[PDB]
Design a protein around this nucleic acid. Structure first.
Ligand SMILES: [Mg+2]
Ligand SMILES: [Mg+2]
Ligand SMILES: [Mg+2]
Ligand SMILES: [Mg+2]
Ligand SMILES: [Mg+2]
Ligand SMILES: [Mg+2]
Ligand SMILES: [Mg+2]
Ligand SMILES: [Mg+2]
Ligand SMILES: [Mg+2]
Ligand SMILES: [Mg+2]
Ligand SMILES: [Mg+2]
Ligand SMILES: [Mg+2]
Ligand SMILES: [Mg+2]
Ligand SMILES: [Mg+2]
Ligand SMILES: [Mg+2]
Ligand SMILES: [Mg+2]
Ligand SMILES: [Mg+2]
Ligand SMILES: [Mg+2]
Ligand SMILES: [Mg+2]
Ligand SMILES: [Mg+2]
Ligand SMILES: [Mg+2]
Ligand SMILES: [Mg+2]
Ligand SMILES: [Mg+2]
Ligand SMILES: [Mg+2]
Ligand SMILES: [Mg+2]
Ligand SMILES: [Mg+2]
Ligand SMILES: [Mg+2]
Ligand SMILES: [Mg+2]
Ligand SMILES: [Mg+2]
Ligand SMILES: [Mg+2]
Ligand SMILES: [Mg+2]
Ligand SMILES: [Mg+2]
Ligand SMILES: [Mg+2]
Ligand SMILES: [Mg+2]
Ligand SMILES: [Mg+2]
Ligand SMILES: [Mg+2]
Ligand SMILES: [Mg+2]
Ligand SMILES: [Mg+2]
Ligand SMILES: [Mg+2]
Ligand SMILES: [Mg+2]
Ligand SMILES: [Mg+2]
Ligand SMILES: [Mg+2]
Ligand SMILES: [Mg+2]
Ligand SMILES: [Mg+2]
Ligand SMILES: [Mg+2]
Ligand SMILES: [Mg+2]
Ligand SMILES: [Mg+2]
Ligand SMILES: [Mg+2]
Ligand SMILES: [Mg+2]
Ligand SMILES: [Mg+2]
Ligand SMILES: [Mg+2]
Ligand SMILES: [Mg+2]
Ligand SMILES: [Mg+2]
Ligand SMILES: [Mg+2]
Ligand SMILES: [Mg+2]
Ligand SMILES: [Mg+2]
Ligand SMILES: [Mg+2]
Ligand SMILES: [Mg+2]
Ligand SMILES: [Mg+2]
Ligand SMILES: [Mg+2]
Ligand SMILES: [Mg+2]
Ligand SMILES: [Mg+2]
Ligand SMILES: [Mg+2]
Ligand SMILES: [Mg+2]
Ligand SMILES: [Mg+2]
Ligand SMILES: [Mg+2]
Ligand SMILES: [Mg+2]
Ligand SMILES: [Mg+2]
Ligand SMILES: [Mg+2]
Ligand SMILES: [Mg+2]
Ligand SMILES: [Mg+2]
Ligand SMILES: [Mg+2]
Ligand SMILES: [Mg+2]
Ligand SMILES: [Mg+2]
Ligand SMILES: [Mg+2]
Ligand SMILES: [Mg+2]
Ligand SMILES: [Mg+2]
Ligand SMILES: [Mg+2]
Ligand SMILES: [Mg+2]
Ligand SMILES: [Mg+2]
Ligand SMILES: [Mg+2]
Ligand SMILES: [Mg+2]
Ligand SMILES: [Mg+2]
Ligand SMILES: [Mg+2]
Ligand SMILES: [Mg+2]
Ligand SMILES: [Mg+2]
Ligand SMILES: [Mg+2]
Ligand SMILES: [Mg+2]
Ligand SMILES: [Mg+2]
Ligand SMILES: [Mg+2]
Ligand SMILES: [Mg+2]
Ligand SMILES: [Mg+2]
Ligand SMILES: [Mg+2]
Ligand SMILES: [Mg+2]
Ligand SMILES: [Mg+2]
Ligand SMILES: [Mg+2]
Ligand SMILES: [Mg+2]
Ligand SMILES: [Mg+2]
Ligand SMILES: [Mg+2]
Ligand SMILES: [Mg+2]
Ligand SMILES: [Mg+2]
Ligand SMILES: [Mg+2]
Ligand SMILES: [Mg+2]
Ligand SMILES: [Mg+2]
Ligand SMILES: [Mg+2]
Ligand SMILES: [Mg+2]
Ligand SMILES: [Mg+2]
Ligand SMILES: [Mg+2]
Ligand SMILES: [Mg+2]
Ligand SMILES: [Mg+2]
Ligand SMILES: [Mg+2]
Ligand SMILES: [Mg+2]
Ligand SMILES: [Mg+2]
Ligand SMILES: [Mg+2]
Ligand SMILES: [Mg+2]
Ligand SMILES: [Mg+2]
Ligand SMILES: [Mg+2]
Ligand SMILES: [Mg+2]
Ligand SMILES: [Mg+2]
Ligand SMILES: [Mg+2]
Ligand SMILES: [Mg+2]
Ligand SMILES: [Mg+2]
Ligand SMILES: [Mg+2]
Ligand SMILES: [Mg+2]
Ligand SMILES: [Mg+2]
Ligand SMILES: [Mg+2]
Ligand SMILES: [Mg+2]
Ligand SMILES: [Mg+2]
Ligand SMILES: [Mg+2]
Ligand SMILES: [Mg+2]
Ligand SMILES: [Mg+2]
Ligand SMILES: [Mg+2]
Ligand SMILES: [Mg+2]
Ligand SMILES: [Mg+2]
Ligand SMILES: [Mg+2]
Ligand SMILES: [Mg+2]
Ligand SMILES: [Mg+2]
Ligand SMILES: [Mg+2]
Ligand SMILES: [Mg+2]
Ligand SMILES: [Mg+2]
Ligand SMILES: [Mg+2]
Ligand SMILES: [Mg+2]
Ligand SMILES: [Mg+2]
Ligand SMILES: [Mg+2]
Ligand SMILES: [Mg+2]
Ligand SMILES: [Mg+2]
Ligand SMILES: [Mg+2]
Ligand SMILES: [Mg+2]
Ligand SMILES: [Mg+2]
Ligand SMILES: [Mg+2]
Ligand SMILES: [Mg+2]
Ligand SMILES: [Mg+2]
Ligand SMILES: [Mg+2]
Ligand SMILES: [Mg+2]
Ligand SMILES: [Mg+2]
Ligand SMILES: [Mg+2]
Ligand SMILES: [Mg+2]
Ligand SMILES: [Mg+2]
Ligand SMILES: [Mg+2]
Ligand SMILES: [Mg+2]
Ligand SMILES: [Mg+2]
Ligand SMILES: [Mg+2]
Ligand SMILES: [Mg+2]
Ligand SMILES: [Mg+2]
Ligand SMILES: [Mg+2]
Ligand SMILES: [Mg+2]
Ligand SMILES: [Mg+2]
Ligand SMILES: [Mg+2]
Ligand SMILES: [Mg+2]
Lengths: 202, 146, 100, 63
RNA sequence: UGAAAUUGAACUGGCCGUGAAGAUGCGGCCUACCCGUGGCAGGACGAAAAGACCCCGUGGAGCUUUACUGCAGCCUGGUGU
RNA sequence: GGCGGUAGGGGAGCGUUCCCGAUGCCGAUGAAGGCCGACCCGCGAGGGCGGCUGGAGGUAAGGGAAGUGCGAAUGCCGGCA
RNA sequence: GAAGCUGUUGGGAAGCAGCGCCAGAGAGGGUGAAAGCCCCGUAGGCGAAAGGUGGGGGGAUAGGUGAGGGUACCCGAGUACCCCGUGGUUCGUGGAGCCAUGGGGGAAUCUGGGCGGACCACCGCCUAAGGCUAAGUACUCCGGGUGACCGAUAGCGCACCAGUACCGUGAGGGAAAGGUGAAAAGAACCCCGGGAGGGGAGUGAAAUAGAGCCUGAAACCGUGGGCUUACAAGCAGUCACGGCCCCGCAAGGGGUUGUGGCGUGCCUAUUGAAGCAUGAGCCGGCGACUCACGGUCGUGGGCGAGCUUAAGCCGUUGAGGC
RNA sequence: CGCGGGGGGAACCUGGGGAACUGAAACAUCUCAGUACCCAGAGGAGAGGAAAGAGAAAUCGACUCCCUGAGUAGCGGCGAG
């Protein structure tokens, strides 16, 4: 929806948004798949009847032998022989329409916001990469750890903080991906990062 | 919203048919049962039969080739004035190519149906009927030359 | 190379199983099989002996190898992890928060 | 990879703007000698071709 | 001491029918306790061999020749040497 | 009220291997698998429960990708008759 | 290279409980079983006397840079060009050019000479018959990283001392074969026995973990028991009745079969099979409709007179965007 | 007397030579294909490379490689390709 709870050193001023409302699960899904799809690296290999050390000679004359009938041992029906239709390496990715890419990211952030978890932040007293600081901030922020958080900030020091913290996941502003988003319970991002987010979709 | 329950909205269904099992599609494995069904048939579209294929037709299409290849002639992209009037201002090959119906084409020819709005239509070609609508309200910018 | 591990031949506590808590000085440490011999795991060998030379070999329940993961270095304070402080000229090792 | 347009077919048949297939009337060149004015005329124009049209389409596809 | 080919599973009888037209196995009827050792070779369309005969496949191969086409080789005009 | 059925087409589902679910959850008070069952649920393929073996793994709900279920191929490898 | 200690279950904790801690490290591996803090690592960070690599940074050297007029000296020869025979090209003789050249004729030096698909004109292009040239590209014997890659009939042929054993004159062909247990504590002594092997004792949580030993299925061989059978005729079962034996208080259920009823195996192939047509000894494991590109119809979703990006680039290290 | 060569290298590369099966539902042009293979040579690459080019734009401006152009132009017993 709209109105989002922005947190600052000056209190909890709740600004407004523009994100849509109608959350279409299927669409959201397609995107997520596309993600878990493009990362799928093809490495599974099975040397077919072709690439097998075995000779090319015929085992029996296939006549007046009393035996079955074959050529070389490279035949699949020769335990050890070439795989029949074994999967060879190949890409699993494609090109999901850009519109959808954004449409999802919108409905995504909009969903967790609509539920009431999109806490925009700014005041980061976490002077450096010292986890203690972060957990001390999150504590006074409303993040007792009972909810997995996606931390989107520009500062690389804030990374350090929740970087090791198990119940949280750091991420770049552009790193906004529909997977990790709909992969956590809470979403909390830097106001400045909410700006670049408004760039892709505002 | 959590990972669980995002799946296809009931209509993806990767229900790939398994042609061999014991029920549904068994021994023969999918529609077969006869012979010449193991490697592959002829084409068959356009091709087999054994006789003089339906390829009995005859090429009237002249200019059906030449050694030097293809001649270089001004390609004329026919554009309808109905879409032309949609946007108003100064319609030139520049505008129609940037967004419209030109696609790095060569020549532009306004014509067709619709009701030409009052504006300068800088085209390379004009239909006799197309020269009427725009002459009832507007100007007729012809092409270049050199 | 790199085989080097925790302690050596000194004062050690056993936090393993059948001899948990027990303390003892480690007399042997076999890097290959990554194990140390203290005074803990001491099982009985019935065997007379593999080499006929010297009649009686012993029904000895002698010291047995023990994984060098369950033994721990120690000092005045009982049971501490290892830290290394390059001295003023050499390379010595300090325990948790004390010397050597 | 990439269907290859059956040139032979294209050089002798062009597809309509709708979903039909058209070709020149057959038997007008060789056999000719003195066939009624009707013949040579009826053989001048073109025609539709029913089922096999669906086949020929499956050739000049990228076309 | 210790094989073999073979082997759907067997609780594996005769006759007259019968059946894809030559039944231990289906009908009717007649015989007929269970198990084996030695011997014969009529049946199990006995075993072995995806019939050598025959036909079919726009299969394969060797061979012939005034089948086609082509090559070596030989004859020959011009020509360079 | 329809519901014999081969070639066929169409529909629904079961199980197998891996993936997200997982920094989770089940698990030595016993994992996977093996053995038994006259119990339970399902039309079914299967699923569940109980005893026994076994000794360290296993993996819901909801989704995703396949080297995905064998009785035969004088099929292949092995073991035994 | 930060951070753990007590108790409890157990043969054994890392499980379970109590209180605490680090975290630029909660990747993974191990430790007697399921450990951020016990061990090896991880994040981050430090390092070379010798060798190799090394314009990325710097310096130096080689080489090279101007106008107008006249002269027209020079500008790649058995070459161009032409013809005969051919190769390359999309070009199969075709209106056949261009590039190359086997045979023959055989030239000029900018008023030169090739070319823009026969050929001519016109217009424009380009300087043949000497040579050199980084990068972007190919590959993977080799080292590393990762896997909706295999997990010993898989995966390389080979996890194991394998291109071995073995087969072939030879070229060449080419296997099978992994696992005790946390620890070897791998069984002292006694008993029978020539030995192998067992039996008792001792080890272990466990010895139907005792040594090609984890799990240990099937075919297959065997011992004990219950039921059954020597007047019987059969695709071996199925329906009923009865008797025997076995679980339950009962009703009931299970195992077995005496008698009666009914009854032509499976697969394939066929007009048609139990067929005296095919295939199968038996078991267990291996085994056959896929993948890429393009097309087509259906379908879910986005967007709509528009829809969509390709290579690649920036980013990351299982983030996307341009 | 000095400088160099010889030979080996999984794959990759240029050059010299170069099939047939197969397809055309026969087959001989055509196809497979400059593929397989042989031989020589090079190197971490090779090849190629500054125009006697391209081609219709009084346009580009070495070579190489990717996408595209395009299954287009065109080639073809105008068959298969
Ligand atoms: Mg091969
Ligand atoms: Mg081979
Ligand atoms: Mg070999
Ligand atoms: Mg072969
Ligand atoms: Mg071979
Ligand atoms: Mg072969
Ligand atoms: Mg061969
Ligand atoms: Mg035969
Ligand atoms: Mg294999
Ligand atoms: Mg193999
Ligand atoms: Mg294999
Ligand atoms: Mg793909
Ligand atoms: Mg696909
Ligand atoms: Mg696609
Ligand atoms: Mg994290
Ligand atoms: Mg919701
Ligand atoms: Mg719907
Ligand atoms: Mg059916
Ligand atoms: Mg079958
Ligand atoms: Mg068949
Ligand atoms: Mg037939
Ligand atoms: Mg075939
Ligand atoms: Mg014209
Ligand atoms: Mg013109
Ligand atoms: Mg309109
Ligand atoms: Mg203890
Ligand atoms: Mg006629
Ligand atoms: Mg006329
Ligand atoms: Mg037989
Ligand atoms: Mg048989
Ligand atoms: Mg009888
Ligand atoms: Mg009878
Ligand atoms: Mg006797
Ligand atoms: Mg006898
Ligand atoms: Mg005899
Ligand atoms: Mg006989
Ligand atoms: Mg035959
Ligand atoms: Mg023939
Ligand atoms: Mg022949
Ligand atoms: Mg000759
Ligand atoms: Mg029915
Ligand atoms: Mg019916
Ligand atoms: Mg069917
Ligand atoms: Mg299903
Ligand atoms: Mg959940
Ligand atoms: Mg994980
Ligand atoms: Mg499993
Ligand atoms: Mg189980
Ligand atoms: Mg069941
Ligand atoms: Mg249970
Ligand atoms: Mg047990
Ligand atoms: Mg169990
Ligand atoms: Mg899983
Ligand atoms: Mg398979
Ligand atoms: Mg079957
Ligand atoms: Mg079999
Ligand atoms: Mg046989
Ligand atoms: Mg056999
Ligand atoms: Mg066998
Ligand atoms: Mg260290
Ligand atoms: Mg440490
Ligand atoms: Mg305390
Ligand atoms: Mg737990
Ligand atoms: Mg130095
Ligand atoms: Mg050096
Ligand atoms: Mg450099
Ligand atoms: Mg300097
Ligand atoms: Mg200088
Ligand atoms: Mg100088
Ligand atoms: Mg100088
Ligand atoms: Mg100067
Ligand atoms: Mg100058
Ligand atoms: Mg002069
Ligand atoms: Mg010159
Ligand atoms: Mg010369
Ligand atoms: Mg000269
Ligand atoms: Mg010329
Ligand atoms: Mg010319
Ligand atoms: Mg010449
Ligand atoms: Mg002469
Ligand atoms: Mg001169
Ligand atoms: Mg030119
Ligand atoms: Mg010319
Ligand atoms: Mg011309
Ligand atoms: Mg002139
Ligand atoms: Mg030159
Ligand atoms: Mg590359
Ligand atoms: Mg490696
Ligand atoms: Mg490697
Ligand atoms: Mg696996
Ligand atoms: Mg596994
Ligand atoms: Mg193997
Ligand atoms: Mg041992
Ligand atoms: Mg003993
Ligand atoms: Mg013994
Ligand atoms: Mg003994
Ligand atoms: Mg003994
Ligand atoms: Mg024993
Ligand atoms: Mg057991
Ligand atoms: Mg055991
Ligand atoms: Mg034993
Ligand atoms: Mg041993
Ligand atoms: Mg043994
Ligand atoms: Mg065993
Ligand atoms: Mg084991
Ligand atoms: Mg074990
Ligand atoms: Mg057993
Ligand atoms: Mg055994
Ligand atoms: Mg017995
Ligand atoms: Mg008995
Ligand atoms: Mg018995
Ligand atoms: Mg009687
Ligand atoms: Mg009786
Ligand atoms: Mg009877
Ligand atoms: Mg009783
Ligand atoms: Mg009782
Ligand atoms: Mg009772
Ligand atoms: Mg009763
Ligand atoms: Mg009873
Ligand atoms: Mg009863
Ligand atoms: Mg009963
Ligand atoms: Mg029983
Ligand atoms: Mg009967
Ligand atoms: Mg047959
Ligand atoms: Mg027949
Ligand atoms: Mg039939
Ligand atoms: Mg029979
Ligand atoms: Mg039979
Ligand atoms: Mg027969
Ligand atoms: Mg037959
Ligand atoms: Mg047989
Ligand atoms: Mg046999
Ligand atoms: Mg056999
Ligand atoms: Mg057999
Ligand atoms: Mg089996
Ligand atoms: Mg089998
Ligand atoms: Mg399979
Ligand atoms: Mg399969
Ligand atoms: Mg497709
Ligand atoms: Mg169509
Ligand atoms: Mg469609
Ligand atoms: Mg579609
Ligand atoms: Mg729709
Ligand atoms: Mg649609
Ligand atoms: Mg709809
Ligand atoms: Mg739609
Ligand atoms: Mg819609
Ligand atoms: Mg990460
Ligand atoms: Mg992973
Ligand atoms: Mg000298
Ligand atoms: Mg030398
Ligand atoms: Mg050499
Ligand atoms: Mg060399
Ligand atoms: Mg090569
Ligand atoms: Mg070559
Ligand atoms: Mg052919
Ligand atoms: Mg023939
Ligand atoms: Mg041929
Ligand atoms: Mg040929
Ligand atoms: Mg060719
Ligand atoms: Mg060549
Ligand atoms: Mg060549
Ligand atoms: Mg060489
Ligand atoms: Mg080069
Ligand atoms: Mg060169
Ligand atoms: Mg041109
Ligand atoms: Mg590239
Ligand atoms: Mg291309
Ligand atoms: Mg023809």
């Amino acid at each position: 929806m709209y109105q989002i709870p922005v947190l600052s050193p000056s209190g909890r001023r709740e600004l407004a948004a523009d994100l849509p409302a109608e959350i279409n699960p299927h669409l959201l899904w397609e995107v997520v798949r596309w993600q878990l799809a493009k990362r799928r690296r093809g490495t599974a290999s099975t040397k077919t009847r072709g690439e097998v050390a075995y000779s090319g000679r015929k085992i029996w004359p296939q006549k007046h032998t009393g035996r079955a009938r074959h050529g070389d041992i490279g035949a699949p029906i020769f335990v050890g022989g070439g795989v029949v239709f074994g999967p060879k390496p190949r890409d699993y990715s494609y090109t999901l329409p850009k519109k959808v890419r954004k449409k999802g990211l919108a409905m995504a952030v909009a969903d967790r916001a609509r539920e009431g978890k999109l806490l925009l932040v700014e005041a980061f007293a976490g002077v450096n990469g010292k986890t203690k600081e972060f957990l001390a901030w999150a504590k006074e922020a409303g993040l007792d750890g009972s909810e997995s958080v996606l931390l989107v900030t520009g500062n690389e020091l804030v990374r350090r903080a929740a970087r090791n913290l198990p119940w949280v996941v750091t991420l770049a502003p552009e790193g906004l991906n529909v997977y990790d988003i709909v992969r956590t319970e809470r979403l909390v991002m830097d106001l400045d990062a909410w700006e670049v987010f408004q760039n892709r979709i505002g | 919203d959590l990972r669980p329950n995002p799946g296809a909205n009931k209509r993806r269904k990767r229900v790939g048919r398994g042609p061999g099992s014991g029920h549904g599609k068994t021994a023969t494995r999918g529609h077969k049962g006869q012979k010449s069904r193991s490697g592959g048939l002829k084409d068959p579209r356009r091709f087999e039969g054994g006789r003089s294929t339906t390829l009995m037709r005859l090429p009237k299409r002249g200019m059906q080739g030449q050694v030097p290849g293809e001649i270089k002639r001004p390609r004329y992209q026919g554009v309808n004035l109905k879409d032309l009037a949609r946007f108003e201002g100064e319609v030139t090959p520049e505008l129609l190519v940037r967004a419209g119906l030109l696609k790095k084409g060569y020549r532009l020819k306004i014509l067709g149906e619709g009701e030409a709005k009052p504006l300068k239509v800088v085209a390379h070609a004009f239909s006799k009927s197309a020269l009427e609508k725009l002459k009832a309200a507007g100007g007729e910018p012809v092409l270049l030359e050199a | 190379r790199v085989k080097m591990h925790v302690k050596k031949g000194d004062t050690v506590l056993v936090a393993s199983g059948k001899y948990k808590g027990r303390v003892g000085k480690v007399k042997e440490v076999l890097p290959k099989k990554y194990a140390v011999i203290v005074e803990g795991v001491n099982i009985v060998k019935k065997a007379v002996r593999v080499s006929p030379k010297y009649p009686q070999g012993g029904f000895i329940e002698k010291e047995a190898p023990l994984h060098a993961s369950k033994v721990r270095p120690i000092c005045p304070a009982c049971g501490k992890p290892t830290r290394v402080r390059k001295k003023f000229l050499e390379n010595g090792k300090k325990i948790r928060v004390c010397a050597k | 990879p990439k269907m290859k347009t059956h040139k032979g077919a294209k050089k002798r048949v062009k597809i309509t703007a709708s979903g039909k297939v058209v070709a020149m009337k057959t038997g007008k060149r060789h056999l000719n000698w003195q066939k009624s004015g009707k013949e040579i005329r009826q053989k001048g124009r073109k025609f539709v071709l029913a089922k096999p049209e669906a086949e020929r389409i499956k050739l000049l596809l990228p076309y």
